[PDB]
Amino acid sequence: ERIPGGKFTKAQGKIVATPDEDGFTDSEVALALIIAAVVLYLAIEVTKSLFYGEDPETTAKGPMTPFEKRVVEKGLFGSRGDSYSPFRP
Amino acid sequence: VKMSPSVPYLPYPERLEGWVGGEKGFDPLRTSDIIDVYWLREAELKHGRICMLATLGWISVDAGWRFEAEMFQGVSVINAHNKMVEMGVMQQMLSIVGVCEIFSLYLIKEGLLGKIQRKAGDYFIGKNFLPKEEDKAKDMQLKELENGRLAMLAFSGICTQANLFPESHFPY
Amino acid sequence: VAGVCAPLTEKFDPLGLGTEEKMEQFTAAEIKHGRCAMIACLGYVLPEWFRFPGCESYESGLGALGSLPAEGWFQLVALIGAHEVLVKPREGGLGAFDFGLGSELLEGQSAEEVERKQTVERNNGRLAMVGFAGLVSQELMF
Amino acid sequence: EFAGGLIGGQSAFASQEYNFDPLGLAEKFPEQLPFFREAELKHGRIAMLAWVGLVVPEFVRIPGPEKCWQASAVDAHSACVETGALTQVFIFCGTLEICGTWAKMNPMPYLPLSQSGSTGGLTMENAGDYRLGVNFLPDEPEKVKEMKLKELKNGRLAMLAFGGAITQATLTGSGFPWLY
Amino acid sequence: YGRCATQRYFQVLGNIHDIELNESLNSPQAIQALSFGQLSVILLWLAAYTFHIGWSGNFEAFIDNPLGVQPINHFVLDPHYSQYKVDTTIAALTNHPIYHWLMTVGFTSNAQIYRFTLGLEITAAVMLVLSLAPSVGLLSMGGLEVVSWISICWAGHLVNFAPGAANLTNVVMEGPGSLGNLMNVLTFNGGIQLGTQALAVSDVAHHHVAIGIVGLWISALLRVSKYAWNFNTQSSYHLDLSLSLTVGGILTSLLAQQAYVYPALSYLPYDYLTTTSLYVHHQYIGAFLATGGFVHGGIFLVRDYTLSNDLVGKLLATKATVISTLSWITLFLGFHATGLYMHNDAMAAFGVPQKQIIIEPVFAEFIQQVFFLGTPVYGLGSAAVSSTPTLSFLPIISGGDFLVHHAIALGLHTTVLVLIKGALDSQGSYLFPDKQSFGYGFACDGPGRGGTCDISTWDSFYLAFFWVNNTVAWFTYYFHWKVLSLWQSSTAVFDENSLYLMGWFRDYLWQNCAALLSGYDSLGSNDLAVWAWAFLLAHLAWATGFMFLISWRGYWQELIDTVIYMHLKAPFFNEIWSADVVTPVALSIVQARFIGLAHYVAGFILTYLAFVVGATS
Amino acid sequence: AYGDGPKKWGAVLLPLTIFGVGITAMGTFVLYTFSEDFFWAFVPGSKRSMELEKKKKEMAEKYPSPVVQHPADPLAGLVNRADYEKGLEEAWDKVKPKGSTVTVEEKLKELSTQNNPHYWRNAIKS
Ligand code: CLA
Numbered sequence A: 001e002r003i004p005g006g007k008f009t010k011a012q013g014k015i016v017a018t019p020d021e022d023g024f025t026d027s028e029v030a031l032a033l034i035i036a037a038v039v040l041y042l043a044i045e046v047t048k049s050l051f052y053g054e055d056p057e058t059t060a061k062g063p064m065t066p067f068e069k070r071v072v073e074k075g076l077f078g079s080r081g082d083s084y085s086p087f088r089p
Numbered sequence B: 001v002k003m004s005p006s007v008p009y010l011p012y013p014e015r016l017e018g019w020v021g022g023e024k025g026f027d028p029l030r031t032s033d034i035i036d037v038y039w040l041r042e043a044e045l046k047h048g049r050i051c052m053l054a055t056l057g058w059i060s061v062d063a064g065w066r067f068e069a070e071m072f073q074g075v076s077v078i079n080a081h082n083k084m085v086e087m088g089v090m091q092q093m094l095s096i097v098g099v100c101e102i103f104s105l106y107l108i109k110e111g112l113l114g115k116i117q118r119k120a121g122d123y124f125i126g127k128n129f130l131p132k133e134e135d136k137a138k139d140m141q142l143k144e145l146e147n148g149r150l151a152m153l154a155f156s157g158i159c160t161q162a163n164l165f166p167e168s169h170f171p172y
Numbered sequence C: 001v002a003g004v005c006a007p008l009t010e011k012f013d014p015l016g017l018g019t020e021e022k023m024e025q026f027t028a029a030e031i032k033h034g035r036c037a038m039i040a041c042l043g044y045v046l047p048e049w050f051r052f053p054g055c056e057s058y059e060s061g062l063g064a065l066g067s068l069p070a071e072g073w074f075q076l077v078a079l080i081g082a083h084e085v086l087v088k089p090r091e092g093g094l095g096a097f098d099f100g101l102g103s104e105l106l107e108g109q110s111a112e113e114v115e116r117k118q119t120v121e122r123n124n125g126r127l128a129m130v131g132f133a134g135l136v137s138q139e140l141m142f
Numbered sequence D: 001e002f003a004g005g006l007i008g009g010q011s012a013f014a015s016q017e018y019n020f021d022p023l024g025l026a027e028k029f030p031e032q033l034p035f036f037r038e039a040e041l042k043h044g045r046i047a048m049l050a051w052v053g054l055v056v057p058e059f060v061r062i063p064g065p066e067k068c069w070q071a072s073a074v075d076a077h078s079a080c081v082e083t084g085a086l087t088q089v090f091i092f093c094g095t096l097e098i099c100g101t102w103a104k105m106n107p108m109p110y111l112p113l114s115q116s117g118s119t120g121g122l123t124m125e126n127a128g129d130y131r132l133g134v135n136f137l138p139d140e141p142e143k144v145k146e147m148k149l150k151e152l153k154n155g156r157l158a159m160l161a162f163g164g165a166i167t168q169a170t171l172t173g174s175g176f177p178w179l180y
Numbered sequence E: 001y002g003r004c005a006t007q008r009y010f011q012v013l014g015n016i017h018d019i020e021l022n023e024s025l026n027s028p029q030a031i032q033a034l035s036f037g038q039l040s041v042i043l044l045w046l047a048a049y050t051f052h053i054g055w056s057g058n059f060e061a062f063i064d065n066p067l068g069v070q071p072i073n074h075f076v077l078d079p080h081y082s083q084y085k086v087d088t089t090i091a092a093l094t095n096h097p098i099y100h101w102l103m104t105v106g107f108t109s110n111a112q113i114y115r116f117t118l119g120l121e122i123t124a125a126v127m128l129v130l131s132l133a134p135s136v137g138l139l140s141m142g143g144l145e146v147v148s149w150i151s152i153c154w155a156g157h158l159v160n161f162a163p164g165a166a167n168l169t170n171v172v173m174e175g176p177g178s179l180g181n182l183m184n185v186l187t188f189n190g191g192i193q194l195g196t197q198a199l200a201v202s203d204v205a206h207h208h209v210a211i212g213i214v215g216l217w218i219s220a221l222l223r224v225s226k227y228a229w230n231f232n233t234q235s236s237y238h239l240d241l242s243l244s245l246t247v248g249g250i251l252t253s254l255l256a257q258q259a260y261v262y263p264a265l266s267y268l269p270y271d272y273l274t275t276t277s278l279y280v281h282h283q284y285i286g287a288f289l290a291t292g293g294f295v296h297g298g299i300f301l302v303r304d305y306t307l308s309n310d311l312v313g314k315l316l317a318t319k320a321t322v323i324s325t326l327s328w329i330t331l332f333l334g335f336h337a338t339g340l341y342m343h344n345d346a347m348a349a350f351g352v353p354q355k356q357i358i359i360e361p362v363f364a365e366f367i368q369q370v371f372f373l374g375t376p377v378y379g380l381g382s383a384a385v386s387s388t389p390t391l392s393f394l395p396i397i398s399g400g401d402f403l404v405h406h407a408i409a410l411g412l413h414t415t416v417l418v419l420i421k422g423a424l425d426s427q428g429s430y431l432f433p434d435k436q437s438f439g440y441g442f443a444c445d446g447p448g449r450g451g452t453c454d455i456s457t458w459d460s461f462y463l464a465f466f467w468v469n470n471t472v473a474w475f476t477y478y479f480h481w482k483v484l485s486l487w488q489s490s491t492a493v494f495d496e497n498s499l500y501l502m503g504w505f506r507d508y509l510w511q512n513c514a515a516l517l518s519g520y521d522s523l524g525s526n527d528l529a530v531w532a533w534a535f536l537l538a539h540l541a542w543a544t545g546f547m548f549l550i551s552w553r554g555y556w557q558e559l560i561d562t563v564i565y566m567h568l569k570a571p572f573f574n575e576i577w578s579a580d581v582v583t584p585v586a587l588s589i590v591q592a593r594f595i596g597l598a599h600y601v602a603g604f605i606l607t608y609l610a611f612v613v614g615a616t617s
Numbered sequence F: 001a002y003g004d005g006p007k008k009w010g011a012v013l014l015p016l017t018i019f020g021v022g023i024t025a026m027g028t029f030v031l032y033t034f035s036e037d038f039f040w041a042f043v044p045g046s047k048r049s050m051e052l053e054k055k056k057k058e059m060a061e062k063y064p065s066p067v068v069q070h071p072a073d074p075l076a077g078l079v080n081r082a083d084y085e086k087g088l089e090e091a092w093d094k095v096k097p098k099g100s101t102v103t104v105e106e107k108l109k110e111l112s113t114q115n116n117p118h119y120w121r122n123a124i125k126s
């Protein structure tokens, strides 16, 4: 039970109807937590990748894909430049 | 000028060279150039294996080889998934497939990042049935890939034909 | 430094117990215990939420020792023992814990990353050992 | 020279070639000319098949759902789209077109031409060359050129023939003779 | 290790995301990876909201009676609550239109919400995976074509979940059919549809498909305009970032305006608090994005621009004219708005409210009557009445709105003046001719040449952010009081008392704080107790910002030196702490200014949020 | 009931998520302060950053890039710096003040040389 505060809550008479049951049970909450744990593992991987930066051999020892080769050659998709610009064209 | 043998008028998709099925060079809409062939081959093998199993599953359960337990008897292949999803059976199969696919996620991530050096589709189950001869090993891999492709198309067929004509069985 | 990660800085031997020679065998014992404890914690958690059709009668936890006809318990023990006696360490393994399973993932992995995987395994096994100890003692006593 | 040395400008009479381009599109767009020949040959082939498929059903028709097959040419298309025949024909033609032309033309078929540009896969030499039935070509360049010219002339004739046939059939109806 | 000072923290943390200075991940692939990680964080935040709405929330009870139920955000489990407060509180209520958005986009169950949370977590995992592998290939992803395709797909979703989709005959299978068949899911009725009191879902879906198609066409046109006249002469991450930030700020401010006046979420206007919070929040976000556009323009000038005879060179050459004219505009607007407000204050105070200077906003009234209104409300410009009018929530302006809009113009022009002045003087002033060699942010140039406090280009943003917050406060006070008068049906208390600023105090701030302050007192505490507590907390943060802004370093450095002396002379601790490890030093001047600004704006935002909640509850 | 659910999950996680997670974050950040790689990318001359720069140089000199890159030394862009200077020399001799004794190579050496020992990359004995 709540003590209403604010003129509009009293005037409009909106009631905070609590659902009878919970809504997510416990099994589906566990599944959400598992998926969040996988996302956390991926986030740890991303953090380790970004903190130590990109190693110099990759992008230098790994040959560019033919798509990347042709894009850099023709200057597309932000290449032939020094910007990111996700909203390029 | 390699002129991929499958589509003669198209240039060979260069990154397919050296892979098991690359001698036919069938990648029009060349996607090996945009996507790493490691990921493409892992996806192809996963689809092929899932379909090689799902084909046999659909055939066996449509013929009438239901499991021992009740809640498995009298359930057709079509209205099977919606049934075992409320019987609690699809949840545990999803759990097992989930741990297998977390293994798969680790393998794909580490392989693409270059940390591990496994081959695409190699989950280290086997390696004592591989023919141990490099030509024969590549032949076995090609057999797996061709059977997986045939099974992908076959399961697509079987499923669509069954669901379009519910009153039928495997010959369709 | 296989087990030493970061909460420590050195070997945790208050009662000096490794002192060479024993250290390798104790490492095998600890790694096996950690693996068993990790899978045992997973076991405690999951049967409470799904039950493997055919097993939806037995009680979980230590009560499963009472339930699950002793023939079935002996079959589980037979599988475990068949593995334990019939697997053996591989060959050029890092120790008696190297039973070859997944060792392909260590091929050309650098010393730091191989040791990091080792330490992750061992620390997770230690946490799972204390976790199972808590689970079993809590289920039994209270 | 005229139209980058493409085949098709030859006249029937003699070495006095036709070279029909009153609006001069070949000179104005020489780098877009392989695309022009691709479009011309594609339209010609489609029109050959289309005129043949306007003539043949007046003689023999496949058994089918009786709404698309047992219909005249002009009113066939709508009923065939409804019956699900032309949707499968579209699936087939779309797969063929995407793979073949969209990969021979776009070096990045996974990207629209607004993003890939290029379009250098269509050269002047391999304009209509989809490598289909090339063993039937005569083994000398002169007769290869003559056969390509035959294909182009028949394709243009089929374009005009299909246009006239469909227009007359809409105006009148009838069968193979689309006269009143 | 760690033989640095505490200054190291605030020195690196101020540039911790200045990846251009981070030589490791300096490539644009790394910046795209940062974008992927940020989008993963956004997806997880939306997953948070959806998960707590579906877990402990009344969405299933909300779809049934959207007018009579208050949306629940999450369950409150604070251990500090007293049993009564525990019995008092049900759960944390909702201050955002996520219930309305979910209802609009077709959610009808908590199972759908749970699947949405799972999908959001999976998409965040996908974003993290994409960030794991930066690559020129991934730089292909994006573009106006991609965002237009996203708009088209959203149109498809809205078509699939439009209320009339049940009556829709399958177009792709049975043909387009009659026009009404398409009207089941694609409409252009225009304006509020009555009932839900929001734009029809068919209208939104049709809007999105049209916008996506037009965006595809516009992107193709822009790229052919790049075919001929291909000139990427000035590429900089800060130039493109400024472009994106300015466009995003314009779009967000437009979103606030057109979402108040054309709500797209069903049963949203019935919820006053969520509407007010939406408008205020989006206007603050838009102003912040515009300020960021100006800031990154200044940064591009500082360290990425090379002088040429181009657009920017022309702007720089006549920067004195720009600054002088902006100063004149601001002086005129401030003088006249303040003087008219003071004149109205004097007239109302002296019991002569008729003698106030009320300049009727005849130009905006002319625009409204001629272009927007369908009935003669003012009668100037046009008096025609529309036979079939459409509905919306466009306010009817009066005399006070003229002065308020002039205050808004003063605020915007002063903010632009500060930002433009700082950006263009980043190239140098006669007090600091060589600012091109000192970087975007620095303390000062010392006491010489008469003094050089706040002479840095970053200090220009520091000064202009107060003006950003002040301008947003001005027009959000305007919006909040206007909608409060409209909802309370006064509409004459506003139109008369907004002419003089004592009205803005008494009838707006003092009047609307009555319920908020009673959140907790000797009698007890109600649901507004949390907001009174946050009100006080925000005031405390604001005054701490005052501390960091007024008092400067040297004093505090000497005080900290004496405190270090006390520690080194203290017993039982000189054996342990020699001040060599992370030496405690006073915050640098730039760090102090930023932290004071941060406390100032944090108190600003939290104070106004608490006030809005306590006033529109 | 409605309360159950978030009550038990909260009693488990909220102590964890706030106390354990925040305290661990604070302690690990204090450790990171005393770590060798503390803000390594933003501390000039840090060991990790210098090793990364050295390895970048090694990769650049071992795997030449077909595309032209922004020259770290602006004069290193020249395809033939010899021709650059030879031209300068010719132009300077054309516009030399009378028989000046100043030559182009000496001027280039004088302009290129600089005595800034306090600039880093020079305080690291480099
Ligand atoms: C099966 C149990 C077991 C075994 C055999 C080992 C074995 C080992 N651990 Mg280890 N460890 C364990 C459990 C175990 N651990 C657990 C649960 C934790 C979590 C706290 C740790 C944490 C840990 C750290 C942090 C480190 C080790 C290290 C080591 C190695 C050297 C230590 C040594 O010589 O002692 C081996 C012998 C024993 C551990 C005796 C086990 C049986 C004793 C007698 C039990 C004593 C009572 C115990 C508290 C149980 C409570 C019940 C009691 C009230 C009756 C060795 C390989 C070191 C290492 O890796 O070297 C680099 C190291 O730094 N361990």
Ligand code: CLA
Residues within 6 Å of the ligand: E013, E014, E015, E016, E017, E018, E019, E241, E245, E288, E289, E290, E291, E292, E293, E295, E299, E440, E441, E458, E461, E537, E538, E541, E598, E602, E603, E606
């Ligand atoms: C997508 C948009 C975007 C992007 C990518 C960037 C990117 C960048 N900006 Mg930028 N900026 C933006 C928008 C953006 N900005 C906007 C909108 C503004 C205007 C507000 C600015 C204003 C701005 C300035 C003034 C500066 C930058 C700078 C930078 C660069 C370094 C960032 C850094 O390390 O800051 C460090 C980031 C922080 C210290 C974050 C502060 C943490 C906040 C304040 C926590 C407080 C919230 C707290 C939880 C509230 C508690 C409430 C209380 C009641 C409890 C980097 C390239 C800097 C630069 O390039 O200088 C060379 C610089 O000086 N930006």
Ligand code: CLA
Residues within 6 Å of the ligand: E327, E328, E330, E331, E332, E333, E334, E335, E336, E338, E339, E410, E414, E417, E418, E463, E464, E466, E467
């Ligand atoms: C109430 C507080 C207040 C006031 C009045 C001002 C006023 C002003 N600020 Mg300002 N500022 C403030 C707080 C304030 N600031 C704070 C807290 C910050 C954060 C540090 C800033 C940061 C800031 C920056 C960074 C800039 C300004 C600028 C300006 C000027 C803008 C031009 C203008 O509006 O002229 C109107 C002037 C007034 C309203 C002052 C009052 C004048 C009289 C009393 C009112 C009129 C009475 C009547 C008409 C005169 C009678 C005439 C005759 C009968 C005698 C103006 C003098 C800009 C500037 O100087 O550009 C020109 C500029 O660049 N300010």
Ligand SMILES: CC(=O)O[C@H]1CC(C)(C)C(=C=C/C(C)=C/C=C/C(C)=C/C=C/C=C(C)/C=C/C=C(C)/C=C/[C@@]23O[C@]2(C)C[C@@H](O)CC3(C)C)[C@](C)(O)C1
Residues within 6 Å of the ligand: B103, B123, B124, B125, C038, C039, C041, C042, C101, C102, C103, C105, C124, C125, C127, C128, C130, C131, C132, C133, C134, C135, C138
């Ligand atoms: C190549 C091939 O073919 O196969 C390969 C595949 C692959 C994947 C590559 C491989 C691998 C790796 C694997 C299999 C990794 C599995 C790791 C697991 C299962 C770890 C579990 C930890 C559980 C913990 C810490 C529990 C902790 C529990 C705690 C802290 C519980 C604590 C409390 O319970 C206690 C104590 C009291 C309770 O009341 C309260 C709570 C909190 C629940 C292999 C081995 O290479 C084999």
Ligand SMILES: CC(=O)O[C@H]1CC(C)(C)C(=C=C/C(C)=C/C=C/C(C)=C/C=C/C=C(C)/C=C/C=C(C)/C=C/[C@@]23O[C@]2(C)C[C@@H](O)CC3(C)C)[C@](C)(O)C1
Residues within 6 Å of the ligand: D048, D049, D051, D052, D132, D133, D134, D136, D154, D155, D157, D158, D160, D161, D162, D164, D165, D168, D176, D177, D178, D179
């Ligand atoms: C490996 C492999 O597989 O080999 C393959 C390779 C490859 C290349 C695909 C092959 C081929 C070639 C093919 C398939 C060639 C087919 C060519 C066709 C069908 C040409 C039709 C022309 C119709 C015309 C001009 C209609 C003309 C109609 C006219 C002028 C009609 C004109 C009027 O109708 C109009 C306009 C009005 C009417 O009222 C009156 C009339 C006058 C009748 C191979 C060798 O085969 C097999």
Ligand SMILES: CC1=C(C/C=C(\C)CCC[C@H](C)CCC[C@H](C)CCCC(C)C)C(=O)c2ccccc2C1=O
Residues within 6 Å of the ligand: E009, E547, E548, E551, E552, E553, E554, E556, E557, E560, E585, E586, E587, E588, E589, E592, F029, F030
């Ligand atoms: C109060 C004040 C200080 C003193 C404030 C300081 C030194 C910062 C206060 C630190 C707070 C109290 C946290 C102290 C450390 C905490 C234990 C958190 C540590 C976090 C790190 C581990 C990252 C200044 O240095 C200063 C400098 C320039 C102008 C004005 C002022 C000013 O007003």
